[PDB]
UniProtKB/Swiss-Prot annotation, chain A:
Residues covered by region (Heptad repeat 1): 1-48
UniProt superkingdom: Viruses
Residues of the full protein shown: 923 to 1018 of 1273
Protein name stated in the entry: Spike protein S2'
The organism's taxonomic lineage, starting at the top: Viruses, Riboviria, Orthornavirae, Pisuviricota, Pisoniviricetes
Phenotype for residue 59 to F: In strain: Omicron/BA.1
Ranges in coiled-coil conformation: 27-71
Known function: Subunit of the fusion protein that is processed upon entry into the host cell. Mediates fusion of the virion and cellular membranes by functioning as a class I viral fusion protein. Contains a viral fusion peptide that is unmasked after S2 cleavage. This cleavage can occur at the cell membrane by host TMPRSS2 or during endocytosis by host CSTL. In either case, this triggers an extensive and irreversible conformational change that leads to fusion of the viral envelope with the cellular cytoplasmic membrane, releasing viral genomic RNA into the host cell cytoplasm.
């Protein structure tokens, strides 16, 4: 009995030395978070209908009224990025 | 090696400016990170 | 101040390059009836 128990422990050590897709449920949570982070990063490169997709590039070229009409947009598009990012994470935090 | 507001040939930012061992090709003037943001620059007065 | 402007059916384009510039000397010119800038506030031409 104790030997067939040790035989199964041995098979597990060989198995974990031989494979990685078995850990695939831990791989899944970190990959969900990896591509979710990657999504939020890509959205700092979106134009959102504004003149330009980068804030400090706008501050290098406009002033006070034709500047803020662009800054409220970047704000809108990014604000939606945060709403959605935190929605996707909150319903995820329920899975975890 | 100090925190500064900067304007490099019209490309502005705020940060610490520090030397680099990453060798740009002769024709390049900006670099870009994974995050698309400007990680590295070549000065227009002195080609470091 | 140049003497002949091109007929618009064949409108003319000057290419300007390799120089410092100033636009304070444009905006503070009394002659102008209209000075609309669409990508850049007219004063900011002097810090770009």
């Amino acid at each position: 009995i104790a030997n067939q128990f040790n035989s199964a422990i041995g098979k597990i050590q060989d198995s974990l030395s031989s494979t990685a897709s078995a850990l695939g449920k831990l791989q899944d949570v970190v990959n969900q978070n990896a591509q979710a982070l990657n999504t939020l990063v890509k959205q700092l490169s979106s134009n959102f209908g504004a003149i330009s997709s980068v804030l400090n590039d706008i501050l290098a070229r406009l002033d006070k009224v034709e500047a803020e009409v662009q800054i409220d947009r970047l704000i809108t598009g990014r604000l939606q990025s945060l709403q959605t990012y935190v929605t996707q994470q909150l319903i995820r935090a329920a899975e975890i | 090696n100090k925190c500064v507001n900067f304007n490099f040939n019209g490309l502005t930012g705020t940060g610490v400016l520090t030397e680099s061992n990453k060798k740009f090709l002769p024709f390049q003037q900006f670099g870009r990170d994974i995050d698309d943001t400007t990680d590295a620059v070549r000065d227009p007065q002195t080609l470091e | 101040n140049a003497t002949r402007f091109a007929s618009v059916y064949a409108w003319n384009r000057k290419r300007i390059s390799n120089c410092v510039a100033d636009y304070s000397v444009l905006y503070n010119s009394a002659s102008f009836s209209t000075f609309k800038c669409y990508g850049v506030s007219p004063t900011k031409l002097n810090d770009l």
